[PDB]
Amino acid sequence: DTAGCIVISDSE
Amino acid sequence: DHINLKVAGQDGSVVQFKIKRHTPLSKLMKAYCERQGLSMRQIRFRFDGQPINETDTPAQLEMEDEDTIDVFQQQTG
Write out the DSSP string of chain B.
--EEEEEE-SSS-EEEEEE-TTS-THHHHHHHHHHHTS-TTTEEEEETTEEPPTT--TTTTT--TT-EEEEEE----
Closest CA to B7 of B75, B67, B73, B60: B67
- Hey, is the C-beta of A8 within 8 angstroms of any chain B C-beta? yes
* DSSP, res A6: E
Residue from B3, B6, B18, B35 whose CB has the most chain A CBs within 10 Å, to mutate: B18
Whole-number Cα distances in Å, B43 to B30, B49, B72: 10, 15, 6
CB-CB neighbors (< 8 A) of A1 in chain B = 12-14
How far apart CA B72 and CA B44 sit, in angstroms, is 5
Edge-first strand order for the sheet with B43-47 is A3-7, B14-19, B3-8, B68-73, B43-47, B50-51
How far apart CA B51 and CA B45 sit, in angstroms, is 6
* φ/ψ of residue B42, rounded to 5: -90, -30
How far apart CA B43 and CA B21 sit, in angstroms, is 23
Which domain, by its residues, includes B21? 1-77
Closest CA to B53 of B21, B24, B16, B77: B24
Hey, how many other C-beta atoms are within 10 angstroms of the C-beta on B48? 11
Hey, what amino acid is at B15?
Answer: V
Domain count, chain B: 1
